[PDB]
Amino acid sequence: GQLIDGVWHDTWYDTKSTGGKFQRSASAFRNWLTADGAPGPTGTGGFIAEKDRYHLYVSLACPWAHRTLIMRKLKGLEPFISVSVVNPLMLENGWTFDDSFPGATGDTLYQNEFLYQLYLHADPHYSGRVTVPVLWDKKNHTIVSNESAEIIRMFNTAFDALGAKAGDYYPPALQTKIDELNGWIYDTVNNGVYKAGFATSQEAYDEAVAKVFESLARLEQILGQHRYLTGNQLTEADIRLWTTLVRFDPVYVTHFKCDKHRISDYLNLYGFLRDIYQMPGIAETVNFDHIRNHYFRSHKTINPTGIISIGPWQDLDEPHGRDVRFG
Amino acid sequence: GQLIDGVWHDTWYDTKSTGGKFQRSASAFRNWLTADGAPGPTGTGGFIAEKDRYHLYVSLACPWAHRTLIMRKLKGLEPFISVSVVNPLMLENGWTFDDSFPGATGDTLYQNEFLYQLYLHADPHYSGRVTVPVLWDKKNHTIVSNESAEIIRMFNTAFDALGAKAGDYYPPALQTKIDELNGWIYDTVNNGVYKAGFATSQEAYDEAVAKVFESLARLEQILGQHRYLTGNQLTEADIRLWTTLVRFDPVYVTHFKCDKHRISDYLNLYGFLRDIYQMPGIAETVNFDHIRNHYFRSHKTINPTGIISIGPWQDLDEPHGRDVRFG
Numbered sequence: 001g002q003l004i005d006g007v008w009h010d011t012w013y014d015t016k017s018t019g020g021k022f023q024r025s026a027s028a029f030r031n032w033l034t035a036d037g038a039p040g041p042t043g044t045g046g047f048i049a050e051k052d053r054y055h056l057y058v059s060l061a062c063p064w065a066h067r068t069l070i071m072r073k074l075k076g077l078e079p080f081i082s083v084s085v086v087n088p089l090m091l092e093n094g095w096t097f098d099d100s101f102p103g104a105t106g107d108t109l110y111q112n113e114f115l116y117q118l119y120l121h122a123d124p125h126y127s128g129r130v131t132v133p134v135l136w137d138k139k140n141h142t143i144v145s146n147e148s149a150e151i152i153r154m155f156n157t158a159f160d161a162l163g164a165k166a167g168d169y170y171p172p173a174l175q176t177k178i179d180e181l182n183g184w185i186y187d188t189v190n191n192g193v194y195k196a197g198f199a200t201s202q203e204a205y206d207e208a209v210a211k212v213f214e215s216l217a218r219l220e221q222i223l224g225q226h227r228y229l230t231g232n233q234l235t236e237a238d239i240r241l242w243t244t245l246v247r248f249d250p251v252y253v254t255h256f257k258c259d260k261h262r263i264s265d266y267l268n269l270y271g272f273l274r275d276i277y278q279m280p281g282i283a284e285t286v287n288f289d290h291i292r293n294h295y296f297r298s299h300k301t302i303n304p305t306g307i308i309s310i311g312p313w314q315d316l317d318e319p320h321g322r323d324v325r326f327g
Numbered sequence: 328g329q330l331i332d333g334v335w336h337d338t339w340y341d342t343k344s345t346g347g348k349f350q351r352s353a354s355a356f357r358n359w360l361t362a363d364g365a366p367g368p369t370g371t372g373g374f375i376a377e378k379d380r381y382h383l384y385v386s387l388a389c390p391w392a393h394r395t396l397i398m399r400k401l402k403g404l405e406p407f408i409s410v411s412v413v414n415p416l417m418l419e420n421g422w423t424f425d426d427s428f429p430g431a432t433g434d435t436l437y438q439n440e441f442l443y444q445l446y447l448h449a450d451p452h453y454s455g456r457v458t459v460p461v462l463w464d465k466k467n468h469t470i471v472s473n474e475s476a477e478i479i480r481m482f483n484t485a486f487d488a489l490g491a492k493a494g495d496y497y498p499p500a501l502q503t504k505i506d507e508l509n510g511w512i513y514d515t516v517n518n519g520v521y522k523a524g525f526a527t528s529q530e531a532y533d534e535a536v537a538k539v540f541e542s543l544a545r546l547e548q549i550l551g552q553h554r555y556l557t558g559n560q561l562t563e564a565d566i567r568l569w570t571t572l573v574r575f576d577p578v579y580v581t582h583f584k585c586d587k588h589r590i591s592d593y594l595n596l597y598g599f600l601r602d603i604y605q606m607p608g609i610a611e612t613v614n615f616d617h618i619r620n621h622y623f624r625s626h627k628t629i630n631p632t633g634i635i636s637i638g639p640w641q642d643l644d645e646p647h648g649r650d651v652r653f654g
């Protein structure tokens with residue numbers, strides 16, 4: 001599933017990467033949207049924050065797109081950023097504006113039917129992956145960003161003066177601590193579960209899966225000491241941990257065979273999971289149907305049957321007391 | 328894949344229709360070992376219980392085979408019954424005498440290569456599945472029985488005058504309850520994990536896995552009232568349930584997608600599991616290396632990578648108190 005020099009290549013990708021790692025737009029969509037329209041640290045201006053200009057294209061299944069939705073909720077960005085939700089099933093073409101599936105909405109702007117359409121509608125000679133989430137500029141018809149880690153930093157502050165809800169999920173004091181955390185939590189866990197669930201060899205799988213539980217144990221301990229990863233405050237590290245956690249019992253445990261312990265077995269990790277979940281307007285950003293149809297039904301490499309498991313038992317509404325406990 | 332009128336048939340079993348519920352060989356081997364050599368209810372006579380004559384061919388991974396090993400220990404039949412353990416791994420020619428794998432012993436009698444050869448040595452023109460366990464008559468060079476449910480009833484009485492340990496696992500007073508439990512357990516549970524695992528449609532899976540957890544729940548009430556399924560007496564219905572229980576967290580949970588609850592989440596089922604496991608002599612009949620290699624690696628249909636999940640944590644040695652709670 002890549003788009004090469006403007007044409008879709010289903011999965012006929014391909015017959016030897018002949019020089020190689022592609023290419024000049026392996027991320028040419030890394031602009032920032034800004035309070036004043038100035039350029040961010042990469043990319044170009046003038047993406048100034050304002051209402052009725054911006055649009056988020058996402059899956060409800062993807063942990064990477066899910067952080068942008070969480071952020072849009074916590075920051076009160078609903079009146080600023082309207083949303084389209086691709087179909088959960090990622091087959092031959094890639095993400096799909098296939099409606100039908102409850103909560104998949106079609107490309108509700110320019111009703112394409114492929115996410116690679118939209119990426120071309122903004123570079124028709126584009127060479128690279130066709131990913132969610134996509135931060136889209138209704139005005140200049142292109143892609144501000146398709147990088148979830150940055151889109152969430154835009155949301156963190158770019159709208160503050162236009163009346164976003166209060167909250168700074170990357171405050172200077174903690175940016176160091178947050179950055180170290182984002183780092184290992186990405187290797188060992190955000191990525192850890194995909195590495196394990198897509199292992200080729202058994203020694204690869206043991207490798208990944210062992211790392212996954214070595215980090216679960218280490219995080220169980222930190223959470224642990226204080227309500228969240230860095231202490232008493234919610235930060236973007238927590239939200240990024242969280243998008244993986246909420247998927248772990250319903251999917252990564254049986255489907256990616258990370259099956260040594262369920263999250264609901266750790267006191268603190270499970271407490272954390274329920275804590276963030278119960279924050280207001282966070283539950284509605286969680287769709288288990290898209291989560292489970294997507295992973296079970298799309299990864300025929302791994303689950304030839306497309307049979308979706310009954311799924312580990314869990315009640316995320318169970319009061320957690322992490323607000324009392326801490327600190 | 329089957330044996331067809333004498334020849335080993337890898338997969339293609341065989342000419343689809345044109346014959347024939349498989350087959351004049353379904354007629355199975357269903358003789359009885361009896362104390363006096365009279366025939367049982369099926370087959371012929373002349374299988375008199377006696378030392379040095381009879382042999383058991385098992386897999387250590389299968390729960391049908393496991394039954395006959397448990398019954399062999401509880402009844403103290405080791406002096407009369409020697410054992411060969413196929414190899415865990417069901418390649419293209421079903422069960423195999425490959426002894427590379429620890430605990431896999433090769434054909435301790437006839438050093439054939441393949442279990443199906445044993446069936447051929449007892450029958451040039453055999454046509455049926457080639458299963459474990461096999462109860463082998465060294466003297467006549469044929470198969471007494473390849474039916475685990477009957478084999479254990481023969482172990483339960485046939486050697487009673489030759490020094491078998493006292494013990495009836497199917498006493499006349501409990502038979503009608505045992506026959507009901509057996510029926511319900513084999514359908515929804517010993518077999519239920521298989522119907523769910525190898526379902527083909529979401530729907531057939533949904534129905535199978537539902538019935539599993541619904542039976543587990545009822546078994547959990549039952550085992551909350553007394554040590555064993557029918558009271559304080561251990562019976563063949565317990566043994567039959569237990570050999571599926573013991574495989575459940577290591578394999579069926581993840582490999583057959585019977586997730587939702589692990590056995591170790593049930594107070595009573597999990598106590599019951601540890602209770603039987605810890606009986607003098609039982610623990611040695613359990614081999615997780617075989618159990619887990621067999622299911623993960625042999626079922627390429629269902630687990631293509633043939634990777635063996637790290638597996639749900641459990642510790643069966645921990646004290647259970649069911650000797651005393653009751654009852």
Ligand SMILES: CC1=C(SC[C@H](NC(=O)CC[C@H](N)C(=O)O)C(=O)NCC(=O)O)C(=O)c2ccccc2C1=O
Binds near residue numbers: 131146148149
């Ligand atoms: C993530 C992930 C997927 S599905 C979700 C995915 N998310 C990302 O994009 C991560 C970075 C991102 N740009 C940002 O930080 O926002 C996407 O939307 N699609 C992929 C595609 O179509 O290329 C997969 O299916 C797979 C399969 C095999 C190995 C690894 C993988 C693998 O690692």
Ligand SMILES: CC1=C(SC[C@H](NC(=O)CC[C@H](N)C(=O)O)C(=O)NCC(=O)O)C(=O)c2ccccc2C1=O
Binds near residue numbers: 391392460473475
């Ligand atoms: C049972 C069972 C198996 S497990 C291994 C099987 N054992 C028996 O069934 C016992 C024979 C007798 N009835 C008993 O009471 O002992 C045998 O050794 N081999 C099967 C073969 O090689 O054909 C399986 O693997 C499978 C797979 C797919 C669908 C159903 C099934 C399915 O139903």
